[PDB]
């Protein structure tokens with residue numbers, strides 16, 4: 001089997017991407033944030049504290065004839081945002097691919113950042129099932145449950161810049177990229193799609209060969225890299241500065257940003273400069289927020305949407321997982 005669904009930016013800045021998901025019988029369609037950095041499928045629900053719902057579409061398990069409460073099971077996750085609740089099993093379909101018995105984690109509580117984002121109805125985790133938070137019996141991701149049925153045990157992320165994109169399950173659309181796909185090793189030891197980039201370049205500058213361990217994380221907006229790398233990037237933008245009050249590098253909105261290249265083996269993925277502009281820091285300001293930021297406070301480097309949307313990305317869930325990147 002295969003599935004294919006369109007993913008859409010939630011706003012004009014590509015702050016996140018939503019993908020429609022059918023849950024239950026009859027179907028209840030929710031728009032979920034597909035997150036390759038986490039492993040829970042959780043949703044706003046009829047159980048969510050009413051004051052914490054502000055425009056989201058909710059899952060109502062009592063209206064699904066296939067929903068079954070998973071007795072004694074709870075979940076709780078933190079990303080500074082958080083959410084928690086109880087657990088149903090139900091039928092879940094993405095893009096025509098159906099899993100029966102998927103754990104659907106129904107929120108009783110969500111933090112303010114989720115409440116304040118009316119466009120995101122929950123998350124669909126695509127990291128490794130070792131990170132799933134359900135207790136006392138951990139549950140499998142949608143991809144893990146689907147994998148044996150898929151034509152090939154893979155999914156692909158093709159995120160658009162200011163444009164729609166696609167998540168495919170079970171096949172690699174050879175028309176969606178240029179050149180070849182370069183595959184690179186993955187460590188699953190921390191439960192992530194963790195890999196090592198071979199280096200970087202800023203604009204038209206020389207490529208610096210250096211190992212950068214990080215995660216391919218569709219649920220993170222920005223590109224978080226070591227302080228040395230990030231300083232080298234912003235040094236090429238006249239007037240850019242790290243702002244303690246804003247919480248990262250900012251730059252004059254009138255600037256033209258250079259591209260940023262990252263290495264995948266001997267291959268190179270070029271992020272156009274415009275992908276790195278996250279707009280005014282507050283409405284009407286002429287200072288803009290940068291899309292490449294230091295990972296120093298995080299403890300891991302994160303190839304978030306800024307990086308991934310410059311590529312066609314293969315999440316290969318074969319017995320030894322790998323990641324593939326192609327230009328597009």
Ligand SMILES: O[C@@H]1CNC[C@H]1N1CCc2ccccc2C1
Nearest residue numbers: 035037038079217219220298300
């Ligand atoms: O918010 C992200 C969306 N995808 C998963 C979430 N992860 C990313 C990795 C990470 C590393 C250190 C501490 C927290 C986190 C949160």
